Subunit: 184 residues, 2 copies
């Protein structure tokens, strides 16, 4: 295949995966971002990178956004949000993050294939992601890509869409858009 | 209005945008990756995040992948490839990177909206990205999202498409990874 055909193939995969996400949980996420005084994102590897890109945009929008596990991460307080992207829902690091977060009476929101997983079970809000063996045998999910790729891409677009819904709720657009980005 | 609808909006913007890329360039980037003995990715901010995603997946295929500007990045020798993602092609940190790389006889590929930009003029391979004033005035390029969002999403999708082409050329699939 041509590289551009692979791009288009990828975008085909992302269609079946996207829409399939439930609005009620998603749109609830945006309200939590609006209330909580602090917001933390989290993920491992490539999912970690996507979490970072979301926190970057949130900061640009002027939320007190943070990334779990960086050098200058502040302590979570009661009420703060924690957003966790994890396919498996099993990554031991992020289990600990959710558990520790709930103990401090933070709110945990998990984005995962497996709502029943160790991370899902802890979450106050689950945004269920496609990729289940049931989804695959269904025809509701399929992929040509090495493991993680489609789920990681779904995180990005999903995160960026949450950005759009926050702009809307705050009455802004990609033209007005004043972003708080680094200077030096 | 609803988040899943905005997802679809983004999907729409990507369909118009993504495939808008030239394969002659693309497949030659895959060609270069298989040639060079060391591969370096590069970017700033979010584009930097995408390039880290690339290098990681390139690492997974057993390529000699690194990311410009990390603690353990080794020195570039002649022949090596450096892949640079820059919307405007005018990020100062990356201009230097591009410059230094060529000045060391490395091969430079740049993924920018502006081929004649500072970074463009330094590159051996350009992968022109969608977003130009022309394409804007044309009515072909529209984005409802904060600046760079679309270019960045595109970078990621392209990088993962390039991974797939590399798998094809190496005769492997999702399983063998």
């Amino acid at each position: 295949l041509k590289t551009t055909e692979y791009v288009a193939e990828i975008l085909n995969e992302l269609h079946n995966s996207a829409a399939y996400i439930s609005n009620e949980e998603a749109d609830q996420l945006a309200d939590h971002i609006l209330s909580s005084h602090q917001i933390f994102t989290a993920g491992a590897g490539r999912s970690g990178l996507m979490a970072k890109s979301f926190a970057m945009r949130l900061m640009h929008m002027g939320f007190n956004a943070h990334i779990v596990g960086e050098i200058l991460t502040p302590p979570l307080a009661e009420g703060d949000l924690v957003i966790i992207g994890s396919g498996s829902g099993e990554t031991k690091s992020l289990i600990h993050t959710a558990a520790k977060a709930k103990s401090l009476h933070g709110i945990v929101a998990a984005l995962t294939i497996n709502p029943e997983s160790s991370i899902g079970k802890q979450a106050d809000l689950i945004i269920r992601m496609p990729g289940s063996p049931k989804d695959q045998s269904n025809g509701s999910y399929k992929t040509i890509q090495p493991m993680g790729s489609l789920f990681e891409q779904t995180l990005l677009l999903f995160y960026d869409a949450v950005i759009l819904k926050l702009m809307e709720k705050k009455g802004l657009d990609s033209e007005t858009m004043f972003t708080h980005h680094a200077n030096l």
